[PDB]
Design a protein around this ligand. Structure first.
Ligand SMILES: [Cl-]
Ligand SMILES: [Cl-]
Ligand SMILES: [Cl-]
Ligand SMILES: [Cl-]
Ligand SMILES: [Cl-]
Ligand SMILES: [Cl-]
Ligand SMILES: [Cl-]
Ligand SMILES: [Cl-]
Ligand SMILES: [Cl-]
Ligand SMILES: [Cl-]
Ligand SMILES: [Cl-]
Ligand SMILES: [Cl-]
Lengths: 298, 297, 297, 297
């Protein structure tokens, strides 16, 4: 109850790159202000959506500082500092601390098969480098490849320093089990395509990549469920999933950046290689989506 | 034209006696018990009914008994699915003779069959059903058949198919199916995500835990219709508490034990290789029964 | 003291007729065809035998005929496995009356059964087998039962177990089992890694492809004993050229089609939902039959 | 014209100091130790080398040190693989400057990239390699990239590819790759099936356990060429007893610990979050080191 300021809808911030795949500091600032203007509660910087695992530590630090300049004091700031290496993760956590972030986050170290105790000592070290700001633990069985148990999840979110769990799992039975076991836990829905259902299962918020282009739709699902308007929440989720269908067809990250480009937010919609660029045949649909979303705002 | 198939329908358990033979007397009382709960229908002879440890003659016996007890009072759905298409046809013809409202068949399992072979499998059963609608399966877990949206479209649009039993925890696919087929009858398969399943697109449910607490699931439906999301969450919590226990003791045998302490079933045995419930769990299961009975009224 | 179970033993196909009834005459011809190939035994009523689309009466009949044709001439192994323990026992007692040298039971599948429930399942079947040895299964793929080395030790050391049918491509586990059980009879399940499976610890195999080319697998066994690792490799190449084709056309139905062109089977049909072979593959399958026939003599 | 890339090559470990910085002195001694074992080459900066907890600058430091010690003495292969293509190109250009005989890149992981995106990734590295052959991966396990035979046939025919590191236990695919590409340089990835992997088609190996007992694997290669299948099995048995121990304690840290008790590495630490070896395992790991040292003289 002492870290209640971490609840809400927070876009997983994309990292804009230039024509040579270097950070586009100018576009990054505009994206932070664009999200603030959507009414989001916070911003999740340097995550998987931010293409952190194709950036260097110095680059991820560069992004963390720019976002903190634009957003500190305006919306909640969460820095994803996770690496495979515990020392590299500690470097980013100390940096987030220096920049004034409200919390840090770390994906379960992946690739190599680490024991559960190793995962805990990994979070304990990062939490120490965070030097007093809460940790948002991860439970992503899909991409990371770490299948956990309820009692393991219960041990993670009880570590001294953990103040939230980012639940990137479609298993809403486990979502309900987590909520039932930890009534006060800040619990982010990680899959935008089941946002409405994730909230009903126990989540009290979300962190998603598609929030960068239509965060108001997800804010509206929250409003609808609070109001008892299940039909409105369903219709909103249908629309979000029409978009996600398109983003899956064309590439989620590059598709979102392309929409933000046609929205005149990002100057370059590139992802870093080996992400290929968007195919020409998809450009017409993505531009029309931008016009739809911009007219839908006001 | 098949809106009479929507609703909450328990996946019926098949009661056995001390020697693991069908307990006809307890089977009739179980049907009565579910009818007295307010269910919209009953799903007979499914995986919950231990159909794949019974004979064709035994599954027909259960079908005929349930039809006698329920036909004309609630919707009757007969799971006629086997691996063999011919065996599945035999039970479809029997359900048609017994006056069932619909048939159902699990995707042929164990052997790897092509999608075309699945569709022909259903066509053969739809033919022996002889005018009653078919409920198809999308169960990627136990059966081991991972499908695609376009493949789901071809199944639900087969002439004769009238509903889809969605036994999947992926509520993105649930939504995609509802978006593609607004009028489709869509059963949520996993009771533990029932409330989320409805919100994702399901308009009903077929579950094994309905046998002991159908009113909770019927309550979730009402709560979401009335816009009482808080109430729906509370009910799903209580359902998932029970499911936590049933998973610990054994789902089917735990349900039968609760029904035994409810004085519905005389013998809560499942058929071997299912072991019986451990003695150390009997106290909790009896306490659960007493709780559900007092909660009823 | 059960070393007579080691060797190459074809997994027997179950021939059917035009109306998908059991073809008793083609069955006898197949048993005689395999005995001419020089196999060490026959594995009856298995997954290759399409046991799970047959009735208990049908499987008992196939067991009895194979016994009439082969008893006293080659080793007889009866797969009696069913999901139901009682059903498995009935077939176990039947194989005992028919004089089979051993029985086998796939790990009960579909439903999630504890490892202890698997062991009791095997105990019950071994008791009904009344003194003939049991062959256990470690088939993680089709059955869906992922086991542990220690669990494998408990199974193969059960009173009555005399062999293990290892249907797993994990040849690390194959080596661990041999290292832990130097005298255990150990069959390689996947024919496409037969040579590598033997080198990892297996002392035999049970394969569906042995029905059309057992001599190649018998030659691999001989090549490895002689030290001609080149011959074993080339023999495995040829077996996998064929397995490549069978995977493309359908393994069971493709094997029967070859046997049909060999004049062994009258109808190369499997039972629905298995579809028949596409006409476009008939030329290739016939050309393989002539190659295999000319190859032998 | 890439036959010089065949043979047994240890996946070099990266020694660290008490402060987990690179231990240059122990690295050089490890390269000399492998060279003294009779290996055909060294695989530097791979998964075994803990490349994914190091920095680009650190991996370059290792590549250059090894090239100083080994160039002109054994084949040098630098694993330049990163998720990022640009980062992989930087290390590929550095391997070119240091005179490596070939580069290698694991399939980019974590993010789901299309197969075409994988090829352009490899194409880009081959260009920065500036003329030295590429070794592509087929590792479906850790990386999470399940490929197809035709996709494998496209990767190993890319201009610049000269070998394939087959890190898969599926020895059916191994034989298929060998049959489709008779001349391909093909490394067996899993040490626990090395003998069976060679028999299936592989003509070499890249393994982490080679750092402490390469002569056993070099002996398996000799035993098979000699036709002494019995000896090959015995060697693989002994190798798998070690691997059983290494799995229990942690493969990388266990290998480094054995190398520490061999007075090769001064510090057996892996980088966090890898924990150190537990004290209760030290006695065994020291006994293993003593066994291996007496074994080779
Ligand atoms: Cl993210
Ligand atoms: Cl784990
Ligand atoms: Cl809510
Ligand atoms: Cl704008
Ligand atoms: Cl069911
Ligand atoms: Cl009757
Ligand atoms: Cl006859
Ligand atoms: Cl079989
Ligand atoms: Cl007869
Ligand atoms: Cl004939
Ligand atoms: Cl490696
Ligand atoms: Cl060789």
């Amino acid at each position: 109850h002492m870290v209640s300021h971490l609840r809400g809808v927070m876009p997983a911030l994309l990292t804009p790159f230039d024509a040579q795949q270097n950070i586009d500091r100018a576009s990054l600032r505009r994206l932070v202000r664009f999200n603030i203007e959507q009414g989001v509660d916070g911003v999740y910087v340097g995550g998987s959506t931010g293409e952190a695992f194709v950036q260097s530590l110095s680059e991820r630090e560069e992004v963390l500082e720019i976002v903190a300049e634009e957003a500190k004091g305006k919306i909640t700031l969460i820095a994803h500092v996770g690496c495979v290496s515990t020392a590299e993760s500690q470097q980013l956590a100390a940096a987030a601390k220096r920049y004034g972030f409200d919390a840090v986050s770390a994906v379960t170290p992946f690739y190599y098969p680490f024991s559960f105790e190793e995962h805990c000592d990994h979070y304990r070290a990062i939490i120490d480098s965070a030097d007093g700001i809460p940790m948002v633990v991860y439970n992503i069985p899909a991409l990371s490849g770490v299948k956990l148990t309820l009692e393991q999840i219960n041990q993670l979110v009880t570590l001294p320093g953990v103040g939230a769990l980012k639940q990137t799992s479609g298993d809403l039975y486990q979502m309900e089990q987590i909520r039932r076991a930890h009534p006060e836990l800040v619990l982010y829905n990680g899959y935008d395509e089941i946002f409405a259902s994730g909230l009903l299962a126990g989540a009290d918020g979300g962190i998603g990549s598609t929030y960068n282009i239509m965060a108001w739709r997800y804010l509206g699902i929250v409003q609808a469920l609070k109001e008892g308007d299940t039909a409105k929440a369903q219709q909103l989720q249908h629309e979000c999933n029409k978009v996600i269908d398109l983003l899956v067809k064309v590439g989620v990250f590059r598709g979102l950046k392309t929409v933000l480009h046609y929205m005149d937010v990002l100057s370059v919609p590139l992802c870093r290689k080996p992400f290929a660029p968007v195919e020409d045949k998809f450009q017409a649909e993505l531009k029309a989506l931008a016009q739809q979303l911009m007219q839908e705002r006001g």
